[PDB]
């Protein structure tokens, strides 16, 4: 549910890290990110108001990097700048009941990864 959608979001994000960061530590990155997102999202997931807390759940990498990304970098031995450098600039990822979607660039459109 929430778990599945976190996975599609995770899969999307680390697809940018593979082949430029060490395979094994990227996996660990994925693993930590999943745990931290669950941990954060716990208590803030309302399937009947999909949009409630969405601004909260939003994973954003502007000129500021979302804390869960920083944390997952630390916990995987990965330089936070190497992680940033390999992900799209101005990335937003919205993980909401029934839909995960993302934007790239401040004037980018919103693209949908998963919806049901
Ligand atoms: C996205 C928003 C329109 N929304 C709010 N509650 C929902 C329940 C379902 C469902 O029955 O699967 C689908 C969409 C829903
Ligand atoms: C005003 C600006 C510097 N700023 C400070 N915290 C922020 C968080 C987000 C976010 O999570 O989307 C976006 C912008 C933020
Ligand atoms: Na390695």
Numbering used by the authors: 0 to 115
What does the paper say about this structure?
The anti-proliferative protein Tob belongs to the Tob/BTG family and plays important roles in cell proliferation, embryonic development, cellular differentiation, cancer suppression, and apoptosis. Two conserved regions of Tob, termed Box A and Box B, mediate the largely hydrophobic interaction with CNOT7 and are conserved in other family members, including BTG2. TobN138 consists of five α-helices and four β-strands that form two anti-parallel β-sheets.
To provide structural insight into fragment binding, crystals of human Tob residues 1–138 (termed TobN138 hereafter), containing Box A and B motifs, were soaked with a buffer containing several fragments. Structures of TobN138 with two inhibitors, corresponding to compounds 1 (i1) and 6 (i6), were determined to 2.3 Å resolution. The i6 complex structure revealed two inhibitor molecules from the electron density map. The first is located in the CNOT7 interface close to Box A, where i6 is coordinated by Lys63 and Asp89 and stacks loosely against His59. Lys63 of Tob adopts an extended side chain conformation in the inhibitor-bound structure and would clash with Lys254 in CNOT7. Lack of sequence conservation in this site together with the low inhibition by i6 suggests it is dispensable for the CNOT7 interaction, but could be useful for design of inhibitors targeting specific Tob/BTG family members. Glu47 and Phe97 are strictly conserved in the Tob/BTG family, but this binding site is distant from the CNOT7 interface. The second inhibitor shows 43% inhibition and binds to a site close to Box A in the CNOT7 interface; mutation of Lys63 in this site reduces the binding affinity between Tob and CNOT7 to 47% of the wild-type.
